[PDB]
Design a protein around this ligand. Structure first.
Ligand SMILES: COc1cc(CCc2cc(NC(=O)c3ccc(N4C[C@@H](C)N[C@@H](C)C4)cc3)[nH]n2)cc(OC)c1
Length: 307
């Protein structure tokens, strides 16, 4: 709410970057991650001060409150503690002095996993239509399993750092220029108020990624993330399909309790569908861990054909 000079932003010499070392560019995400722009950073690495690096910059909106500022800081500090990994969106730096708070993170040029897969939908029969006006090359069967593997690896790391995502979905996984899967928004502050089960975002309903125990009793564990990973698996092999198609929220509550699960996608092996079902086990303690998931998916990648 108040001016940014009215507060005391935490300075960290290890991460602090002068503002004139950033060339701000076009908006990124259409604000799914909040106000984030593309930018070029000059001498992000001290060893190469004359090198330009493409980065993503998150900042507060014009209507931001004192709460929003605290959250963005908390998000930044959380990313510091969690540390680095190949398959997450990493912290690269920050601008905390002489202006608005800037949190500098890694840039993924190919958008989120959902739109990434949809644009690479074949004009065939076992997928919905390609909605992209700029379709890219189809992905092999080993590329899809590899996508799941990388996401699992990211979550395995996050879990090892006591991090619970609470909203693992294809929309929250970003794809780099080198087709590297990176998990996004894992350091978000958990809302202290009771949840609205029918809120929108695009027109996405986050309730369809929640484990039953998180849905009904608001209990979030690593096992609830495992459930979400199952839905993410289903998203991958439908190439960006919408979970529980035609099923509204009020019907989803009843269905899940009755043991109802999504059917196997048309193009999905039985082994990979069992993995989804295992992730969608009613008992949280009976779901596989991310460590186990990474091991299985590693085996499956080696056996899956890219022809
Ligand atoms: C912890 O986690 C995060 C993640 C972020 C987000 C950072 C980010 C966002 C992006 N990237 C995009 O948002 C993006 C890029 C390309 C897109 N598209 C457009 C589409 C039409 N065509 C496609 C070919 C490409 C669509 C979206 N990178 N880094 C910020 C953050 O603050 C602290 C923390």
């Amino acid at each position: 709410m108040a001016g940014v000079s009215e507060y005391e932003l935490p300075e960290d010499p290890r991460w602090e970057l002068p503002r004139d070392r950033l060339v701000l560019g076009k908006p990124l995400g259409e604000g799914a991650f909040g106000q984030v722009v593309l930018a070029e950073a000059i001498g992000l690495d001290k060893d190469k001060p004359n090198r330009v690096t493409k980065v993503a910059v998150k900042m507060l909106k014009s209507d931001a409150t004192e709460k929003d500022l605290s959250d963005l800081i908390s998000e930044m500090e959380m990313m510091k503690m969690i540390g680095k990994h190949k398959n997450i969106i990493n912290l690269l730096g920050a601008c905390t002095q002489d202006g608005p708070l800037y949190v500098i993170v890694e840039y993924a040029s190919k958008g989120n996993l959902r739109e990434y897969l949809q644009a690479r939908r074949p004009p065939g029969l076992e997928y919905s239509y390609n909605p992209s006006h700029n379709p890219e090359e189809q992905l092999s069967s080993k590329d899809l399993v590899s996508c799941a593997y990388q996401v699992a690896r990211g979550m395995e790391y996050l879990a090892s750092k006591k991090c619970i995502h609470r909203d693992l979905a294809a929309r929250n996984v970003l794809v780099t220029e080198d087709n590297v899967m990176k998990i996004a928004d894992f350091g978000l502050a958990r809302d202290i108020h009771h949840i609205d089960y029918y809120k929108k975002t695009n027109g996405r309903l986050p309730v369809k990624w929640m484990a039953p125990e998180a849905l009904f009793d608001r209990i979030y564990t690593h096992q609830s993330d495992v459930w979400s990973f199952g839905v993410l698996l289903w998203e991958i092999f439908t190439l960006g399909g919408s979970p529980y198609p035609g099923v509204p929220v009020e019907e989803l509550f009843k269905l899940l309790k009755e043991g109802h699960r999504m059917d196997k996608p048309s193009n999905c092996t039985n082994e990979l569908y069992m993995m989804m079902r295992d992730c969608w086990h009613a008992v949280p303690s009976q779901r596989p861990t991310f460590k186990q998931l990474v091991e299985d998916l590693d085996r499956i990648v080696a056996l899956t054909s890219n022809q």
